[PDB]
Amino acid sequence: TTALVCDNGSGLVKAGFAGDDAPRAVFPSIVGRPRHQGVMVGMGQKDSYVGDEAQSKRGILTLKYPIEHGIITNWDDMEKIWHHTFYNELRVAPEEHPTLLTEAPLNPKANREKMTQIMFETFNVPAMYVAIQAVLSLYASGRTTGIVLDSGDGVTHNVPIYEGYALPHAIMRLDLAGRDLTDYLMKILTERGYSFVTTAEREIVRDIKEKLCYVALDFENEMATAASSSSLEKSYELPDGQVITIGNERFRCPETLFQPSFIGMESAGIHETTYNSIMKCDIDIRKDLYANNVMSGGTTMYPGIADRMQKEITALAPSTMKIKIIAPPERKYSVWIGGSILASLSTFQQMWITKQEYDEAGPSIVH
Amino acid sequence: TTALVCDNGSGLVKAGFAGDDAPRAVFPSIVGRPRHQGVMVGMGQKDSYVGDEAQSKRGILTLKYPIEHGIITNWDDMEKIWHHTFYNELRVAPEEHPTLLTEAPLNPKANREKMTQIMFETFNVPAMYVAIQAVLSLYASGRTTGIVLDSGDGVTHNVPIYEGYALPHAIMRLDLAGRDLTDYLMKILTERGYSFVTTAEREIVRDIKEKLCYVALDFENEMATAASSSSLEKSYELPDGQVITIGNERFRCPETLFQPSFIGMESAGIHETTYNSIMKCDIDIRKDLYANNVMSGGTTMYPGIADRMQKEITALAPSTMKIKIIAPPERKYSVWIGGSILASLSTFQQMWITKQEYDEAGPSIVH
Amino acid sequence: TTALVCDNGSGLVKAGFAGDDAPRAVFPSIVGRPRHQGVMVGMGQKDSYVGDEAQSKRGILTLKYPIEHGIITNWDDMEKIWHHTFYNELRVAPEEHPTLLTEAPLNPKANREKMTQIMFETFNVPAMYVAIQAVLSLYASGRTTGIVLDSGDGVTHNVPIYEGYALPHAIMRLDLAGRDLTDYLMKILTERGYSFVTTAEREIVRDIKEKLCYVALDFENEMATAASSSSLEKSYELPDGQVITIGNERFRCPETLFQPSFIGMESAGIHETTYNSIMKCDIDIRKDLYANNVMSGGTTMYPGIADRMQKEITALAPSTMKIKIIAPPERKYSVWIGGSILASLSTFQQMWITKQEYDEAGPSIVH
Amino acid sequence: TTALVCDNGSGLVKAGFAGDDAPRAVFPSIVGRPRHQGVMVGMGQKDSYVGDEAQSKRGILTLKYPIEHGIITNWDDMEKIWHHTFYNELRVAPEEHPTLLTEAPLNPKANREKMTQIMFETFNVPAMYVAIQAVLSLYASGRTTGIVLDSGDGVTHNVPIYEGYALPHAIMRLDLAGRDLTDYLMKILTERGYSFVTTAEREIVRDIKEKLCYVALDFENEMATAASSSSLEKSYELPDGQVITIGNERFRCPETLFQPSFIGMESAGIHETTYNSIMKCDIDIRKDLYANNVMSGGTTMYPGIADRMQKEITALAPSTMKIKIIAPPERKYSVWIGGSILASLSTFQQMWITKQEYDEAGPSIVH
Amino acid sequence: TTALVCDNGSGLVKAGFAGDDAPRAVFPSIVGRPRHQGVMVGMGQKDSYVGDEAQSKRGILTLKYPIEHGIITNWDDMEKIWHHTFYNELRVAPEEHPTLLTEAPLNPKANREKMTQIMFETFNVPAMYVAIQAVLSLYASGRTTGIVLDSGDGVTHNVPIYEGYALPHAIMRLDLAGRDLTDYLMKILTERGYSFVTTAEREIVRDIKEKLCYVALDFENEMATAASSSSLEKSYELPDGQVITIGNERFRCPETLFQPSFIGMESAGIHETTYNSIMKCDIDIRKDLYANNVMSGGTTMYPGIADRMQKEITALAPSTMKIKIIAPPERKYSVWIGGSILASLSTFQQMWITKQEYDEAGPSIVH
Ligand SMILES: Nc1ncnc2c1ncn2[C@@H]1O[C@H](COP(=O)(O)OP(=O)(O)O)[C@@H](O)[C@H]1O
Numbered sequence A, B, C, D, E: 001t002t003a004l005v006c007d008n009g010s011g012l013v014k015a016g017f018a019g020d021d022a023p024r025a026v027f028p029s030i031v032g033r034p035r036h037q038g039v040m041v042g043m044g045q046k047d048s049y050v051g052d053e054a055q056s057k058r059g060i061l062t063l064k065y066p067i068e069h070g071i072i073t074n075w076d077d078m079e080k081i082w083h084h085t086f087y088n089e090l091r092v093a094p095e096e097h098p099t100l101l102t103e104a105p106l107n108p109k110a111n112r113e114k115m116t117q118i119m120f121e122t123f124n125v126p127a128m129y130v131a132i133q134a135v136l137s138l139y140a141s142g143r144t145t146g147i148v149l150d151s152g153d154g155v156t157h158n159v160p161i162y163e164g165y166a167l168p169h170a171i172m173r174l175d176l177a178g179r180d181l182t183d184y185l186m187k188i189l190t191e192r193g194y195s196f197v198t199t200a201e202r203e204i205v206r207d208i209k210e211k212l213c214y215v216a217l218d219f220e221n222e223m224a225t226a227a228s229s230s231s232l233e234k235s236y237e238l239p240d241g242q243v244i245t246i247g248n249e250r251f252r253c254p255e256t257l258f259q260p261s262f263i264g265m266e267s268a269g270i271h272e273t274t275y276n277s278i279m280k281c282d283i284d285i286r287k288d289l290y291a292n293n294v295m296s297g298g299t300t301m302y303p304g305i306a307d308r309m310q311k312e313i314t315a316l317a318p319s320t321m322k323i324k325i326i327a328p329p330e331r332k333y334s335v336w337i338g339g340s341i342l343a344s345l346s347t348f349q350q351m352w353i354t355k356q357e358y359d360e361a362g363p364s365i366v367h
């Protein structure tokens, strides 16, 4: 019977069978719809495109992320991506597997309840479970204690975890993420003259960000040395064939995680939020958290991030103590891996919510 | 029941039954009327001649193109060519077939509405459809994606088409075409002393253009080598028996498509309009358009055209990317072929406008 | 009711009933008046003689052609020849037949109007019509397209005709004809000593011309070979019994048609005027005219004419194309035959000008 | 010493002395160059025409906007318009005045730096300043708080401003403007048969737009009532003397600001961008912005615009709160007025960039 | 040094020194050659006569226009008229003056190159220039903008000129002119019985045309009133002493300019060609052209022409706008005057083609 593990973040769906090393289907959470009413016969007609297929045809389509900052915005679009996921990639009847789904912490109750309702009623599932992302990543690490920073496309979290357990009062979410950074890279990019106005172009700049951008160790020194352009400008080539050259924009895009004032947010940088989260925890356990802080998610993938974190958190925390930061490679799939390994635990098998139990207890029992 | 496919361009009517490889009736859109009041008895009297028959007797007749730059100028003349077409070549009662008609994009609304009105009221037709030329040519290519350059006698278009669909905001029409080029060849030809003042003589120079003229790869180099006349002068023989020798006029006639400043137009050459049309399209799809650009129509028939296009568009577009130009032989009949194949599609059968539906909905439903 | 066809050229009247192969009455247009006041009793008295009767008595009479170069010179004389024609040869009341009359193209308006006035008022005719000669000859040919050269006694024409119709702007008349040639043969003949001063003798030299004169293929070569007189001198016998021997005068008389400089006219030869007439026509139709050029009239009867025409026109026109000259035997009566066949066409019956229509519309309606 | 205030937008330069009610020189930003090489002697020769002078002679000239979407495209052309501006209209040595220049927000850095370089090096200026347009318009309003929508010929902005200050993260620019609307009015106008292909004709249609076009309160209802043409068709007269009659094209041209899908852009209408800009601002201040939203620029001049804005923004925003829209007359000159009043403030006198300060600090100090 | 201005049109040479009010030598371009080989001793012998001298002796000579429809037909004849012009009227060594020559627009390249070759090689000239006629006439007007209609003996032009400059694509030539009109007056004149067959008589009818013929305001009304002959018949006296009376032929001769169908040409009347030329020009400038249309040349000299033009062009053009026609007296010499004034401009002195520059650059540099 095994299980399905579906990691539904903004920007990417990662899904696959439990007990495996990596997700088989990994595609963008997008629902493409034709921008221009098309006059042909035999075409499509394909009123709605989804996932990688939508990526193939961006210049026709308006791309629409169904899920924004972890919150589901458009429910039938989400349903569409699930249906496509199950039948067109994993090729499976949901009635044959229990399904573990994912969600961000501190996330409105409507997502869990609606989600489960869909999984039971529209797809028919024997049993399912919805899990907090950071815990899954911590399992992926193979560790029981630590503070997880999970930055995906929608949202960034800090969840401190001690010896199992958890500290809900110290959990801190922050809407800064690949989507916010891509938009910021948009408007900063436009100062070189390169105008990317459209949803489809947003995905191009996402690609630019993913390849070229890095996190500087020291910001203003790097900005100073951007004066005499040497290695800092890099050439990137668009799908059109045009050449973009980007210098300080390469590293000032991700600087926004440390300085959210660039987007005009008062929220403290990710280092201050991790630090702050540690502060909120009991005096006894802070040393372990500082030692053991973990990173997850696509927005942790910028080269340089861990080193800057180690500088900044060390600058905030008492110097007498060791702050090791653990950011393993393959960290973008940590959540999914966590899901897999959890589904492979027998002790967890009692915790699935059964179809019948949902039917008799109602929606309130997901929590 | 089959269908009729009528391609009504300026200069030539191509018409025939659907599902066939080529149009059966192909004759000039001309309405000849005697210039000189003729004194005989038993003659004609034949107040109006039409089509090839008018071609047979040019020296008596004033030839009159009913259709100018795609726009219908003289409606009863057009009606005459249709009536002659149906009864004297295709030999068919229009009440027995649905009829697919053609038109240029971006063309005044009066042509569709009046045209349909005539087809329903004067001829009686069970159902009909009016189609954009470039789409038909694209079907003739057997392809779904590409940018069509269709240069006929009246008008030249660029219509970009992606994966079916269409981009109306990037559609670009241009009045440069076999008629404009024939007149330009007139006045340039007169510099050798050869005076062709009359409508009938215009058709002679059209013949000269069709046979002899070619498009140079590089213009000014060829003009330079015209200094020492070798292969560039060619002898042509008129119907009278006189011999014309034309050198640089051979290739400087079609150079006007690339340099409309020869006619005193500010419009950019056809290569700049194709390039410009590609620019107007979304950054994602431009690579396909550059790869896939298609040619149609009689004014694409000059030897050398495709090679010059490949030079010039390559000179405008980023060198990193492949610009294949597809100009198949039999391209002059691409539109008609496209019409045939579309009429042979069953999925299109729903889209005919029915006689009764027109009667109840009115003229506004053609669009 | 049938019709009468009256071909009134200078030198001969040809008249007869329509629908017949040849004119019944064919006699010279002459009005003889006694030169010498005659003293007898019972004689004549016959103050005016007309036609063949005048021919019978030339030595008494002064002969007077009423019609000169197609233009009527003396109206009552013309009336006399008509009256004699109708009552003394055709033996018919004009009130019983419509009457088709003939005239040269480009001929003063006074001839049509006066002529019609006479036919309606003096003779009483139910209806009549006046026709351009060359068209009648073209009907006689049984053809619709061609360029007619009609050389009679008064005038020579070229009228190009295409597919019915006509080209008035290319019609070319020329006063060179049997009368001019007979006078030229007079003065050239006098170099042998043979003096023919009188009107009556002019008719004798007309006979000489009609029998003996021929058109040389090459002129100056024939003149050279006239040096050694062999076949070129021929003996002719006058009515008196005297013998005339004429050598180069035989062929240099008709050479005047090709070289009007012999009479001191600047007008180009008949071959240049036919060629010139073709030039004036639209470039399209010239090939048909060159193929189809027709000959009519008494002054086309010289042996050798067609062959010289074929040489000379071929020398002027582009060699690439075939110039067939059609000069049928019985061509002297082509105009009359044409008239007959036209009168036998029913479609022409609407075009007669009725007595009453003339009465109410006036003289201006003949044109 | 006073100051010069130069508002350099696409389509119009507005310039004048500071502290005055209106700009003295207001002329189009165009650089006319003869299309046809002219053969006269004493003519011009005038290789380049500029401004209103170019407007005087459109039919000879190719008109060329030097500045496109706020971005300077052709630098020497811009220099030419400045030189003409200073010496031929304002009649002033730039060395005698500090000069305040204008620019759109979010505009490539090349414009500020190059612009300043030209002003200091080519013209010699004691000091200068470059200002964001929307702030100047807000000063023109005489108000400190509000959200400015400035639609010129090149670009449209939204800049929210609270109690002085500014919110750069909520600034939103959009390339929809009089130029885009004129081109759209071109292709929509061509459906009536009226073909305007040339740059010179573009200026004619700009005139049509400026006089006749209005913004409908409700779109599709007005389109429905366009069925029975009454007041909606209006006659306009071209400079040639021809009469154009335009019905629904009158109001569907400016509908593009609310529905950029007409041009094939995915960008939300101006009402959604203003609404969106308000959303991006802190929850506290939105009420003031909704109350206080200001309009500027030539493309705000369509009759009906404010009323439709009030409908649409009210439809998006919570009904409980008052949305006053302030669109004062003389709003096309708001930016220039703003510039004047700012230059008349003494407190601003410290902020000029001095010639010497530029010389020692370099180009980087403009920002 | 001054200059010579030689206006070489068909029918008349106008030549003189530059900077003068009128040409000194004005005589017909004819090369008379004796028709009849003359037997005297001491006579002539004068194998070739030229100009006014030939006019003195028409009845002996065959007159030969060397130049036909602007195109040089017979080069040595033209050379003869030039040589006679320089030595026998202007009495000048060409080596002492630069020489400005004239030619029709749109005229075969052979005329410029051969002409210049003769002027440099046969006559020896320090420098020369060949000019388009209509521009010269426009200078004669003292104006910079306008559309010139120049009708000479060979050819009629329309050249639109705006603010200096020129529009070559709107230049329209037409072979209708005093020569065509004189021949048409020939064949129409022959309907009264007056036969003029010879070149010498053609010049007589040219005189008739020049004195008597006028252009009717309304054609068919005047033809109707020709029914009752009052003032419309006028008596003219030939050099022989005979009296010609011509009625409707007086005004129907020049009606051919408005109705070229009289000669069997499909070309539109001169009013349609002026109107058509205006159409071809950019929409901006048409109002000036309509206001400013100029007339030049001998074939503009018919009384009534300007008024009929004003009627007909007003009937074609939109009524809302003023069509002033400027036809100054002395307009037959406008071209020559233009030439004079141009030669008197110092700015033009750079544009002469020098003997040496021709020698080193070749013939291709005349254009
Ligand atoms: N190599 C990379 N470098 C920088 N950013 C990346 C990289 N890969 C992905 N991203 C960013 O992170 C996001 C994907 O992160 P992911 O963990 O998949 O988010 P989620 O799990 O919420 O879908 C993308 O939207 C992208 O902006």
Ligand SMILES: Nc1ncnc2c1ncn2[C@@H]1O[C@H](COP(=O)(O)OP(=O)(O)O)[C@@H](O)[C@H]1O
Residues within 6 Å of the ligand: B008, B009, B010, B011, B012, B013, B151, B152, B153, B154, B155, B177, B178, B179, B182, B206, B209, B210, B211, B296, B297, B298, B299, B300, B301, B302, B303, B332
């Ligand atoms: N072989 C040829 N070479 C160059 N030009 C041609 C050739 N054949 C036709 N043309 C030109 O193209 C025109 C015919 O093109 P066509 O596609 O039939 O126009 P349409 O479809 O609008 O009637 C003619 O008017 C002629 O000027």
Ligand SMILES: Nc1ncnc2c1ncn2[C@@H]1O[C@H](COP(=O)(O)OP(=O)(O)O)[C@@H](O)[C@H]1O
Residues within 6 Å of the ligand: C007, C008, C009, C010, C011, C012, C013, C151, C152, C153, C154, C177, C178, C179, C182, C206, C209, C210, C211, C296, C297, C298, C299, C300, C301, C302, C332
């Ligand atoms: N056999 C002949 N050979 C040469 N010339 C002839 C011959 N017969 C007649 N002609 C000439 O042609 C004239 C008759 O031609 P015809 O066609 O009858 O003139 P029309 O029709 O104008 O009367 C006569 O005047 C005579 O000079």
Ligand SMILES: Nc1ncnc2c1ncn2[C@@H]1O[C@H](COP(=O)(O)OP(=O)(O)O)[C@@H](O)[C@H]1O
Residues within 6 Å of the ligand: D008, D009, D010, D011, D012, D013, D151, D152, D153, D154, D177, D178, D179, D182, D206, D209, D210, D211, D296, D297, D298, D299, D300, D301, D302, D332
């Ligand atoms: N009365 C009007 N109605 C509608 N549009 C107008 C009017 N006047 C000007 N425009 C449009 O606005 C533009 C001028 O706006 P403006 O604010 O001067 O732009 P900028 O300041 O950027 O030059 C013109 O290009 C024109 O298309």
Ligand SMILES: Nc1ncnc2c1ncn2[C@@H]1O[C@H](COP(=O)(O)OP(=O)(O)O)[C@@H](O)[C@H]1O
Residues within 6 Å of the ligand: E008, E009, E010, E011, E012, E013, E151, E152, E153, E154, E155, E177, E178, E179, E182, E206, E209, E210, E211, E296, E297, E298, E299, E300, E301, E302, E303, E332
């Ligand atoms: N007063 C007149 N009225 C009408 N036509 C005239 C008059 N004078 C001259 N012409 C005609 O115009 C011609 C002369 O025009 P001109 O301008 O001198 O021609 P070009 O300059 O080409 O020699 C003559 O051939 C004559 O037919």
Ligand SMILES: [Mg+2]
Residues within 6 Å of the ligand: A009, A133, A150, A151, A152, A153, A297, A298, A335
């Ligand atoms: Mg995630």
Ligand SMILES: [Mg+2]
Residues within 6 Å of the ligand: B009, B133, B150, B151, B152, B153, B297, B298, B335
């Ligand atoms: Mg076509």
Ligand SMILES: [Mg+2]
Residues within 6 Å of the ligand: C009, C133, C150, C151, C152, C153, C297, C298, C335
């Ligand atoms: Mg005859």
Ligand SMILES: [Mg+2]
Residues within 6 Å of the ligand: D009, D133, D150, D151, D152, D153, D297, D298, D335
């Ligand atoms: Mg502005």
Ligand SMILES: [Mg+2]
Residues within 6 Å of the ligand: E009, E133, E150, E151, E152, E153, E297, E298, E335
């Ligand atoms: Mg002239």
